[PDB]
């Protein structure tokens, strides 16, 4: 009642999209260090008993296709769903290797009414990406 | 008998709206480094929002950018937890 039921046969999937190299038109330099993140996440979620699937350097079209396919799987025996996005970004946008795609397009596939086998189950999207170009100068404490 | 179609989503953003997110070429991104560390240390006990709150503190206090370009030097970062969750989330199960 107060806590999500996490005793289904499987914790669920953990989809990791690791974009490191981009098309010059994006003006994004290689995301050095992202492989460390990808490996760290793989191990971390493996220990949490998630079925991890790592995908590297996906175009914006491939990201959409992957998400669509995953949302069409039968998640009935899974307690939750996790998707980790590692890439360049802008507010409300994540970058495929060849260009931007709205995050809303990606998450919509999992809406309570579009992915019935995940209805009532926690859907987590972990996003490592810029959301603009403002910097935080901080304040001394 | 019905729930919102937007319910039960949790968006753990590495940074606040409109801001840069930092990544170290050798150690990885500040956010993912911290997220994995807090999950490894607390997933067997704490509820997810509380783990993410510790991630916020770790990123906010232990990291500061270093750059030869003054424009990108001494910068800070705070992650952004966006929850439409309706229940507490634990990665453990009492049987």
């Amino acid at each position: 009642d107060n806590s999500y039921k996490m005793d289904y046969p499987e914790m669920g999937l953990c989809i990791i999209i690791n974009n490191k190299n981009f098309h010059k038109s994006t003006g994004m330099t290689s995301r050095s260090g992202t492989d460390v993140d990808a490996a760290n996440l793989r191990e971390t979620f493996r220990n949490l008993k998630y079925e991890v699937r790592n995908k590297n350097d996906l175009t914006r079209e491939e990201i959409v296709e992957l998400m669509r396919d995953v949302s069409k799987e039968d998640h009935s025996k899974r307690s939750s769903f996790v998707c980790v996005l590692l890439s360049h970004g802008e507010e409300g946008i994540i970058f495929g290797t060849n260009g931007p795609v709205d995050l809303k397009k990606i998450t919509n596939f999992f809406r309570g009414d579009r992915c019935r086998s995940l209805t009532g189950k926690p859907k987590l999207f972990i996003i490592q990406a810029c959301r603009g170009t403002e910097d935080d100068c901080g304040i001394e404490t | 008998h019905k729930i919102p179609v937007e319910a039960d989503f949790l968006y753990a953003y590495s940074t606040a709206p409109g801001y840069y997110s930092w990544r170290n070429s050798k150690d990885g991104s500040w956010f993912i480094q911290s997220l994995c560390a807090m999950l490894k240390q607390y997933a067997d006990k704490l509820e997810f929002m509380h783990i993410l709150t510790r991630v916020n503190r770790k990123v906010a206090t232990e990291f500061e950018s270093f750059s030869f370009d003054a424009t990108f030097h001494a910068k800070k970062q705070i992650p952004c937890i966006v929850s439409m969750l309706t229940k507490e989330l634990y990665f453990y199960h009492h049987h």
């Binding site: 050095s32 890439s87 970004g89 | 930092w22 990108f72």
Partner: peptide, 4 residues
């Protein structure tokens, strides 16, 4: 350190 680099920015995403």
């Amino acid at each position: 350190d680099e920015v995403x």
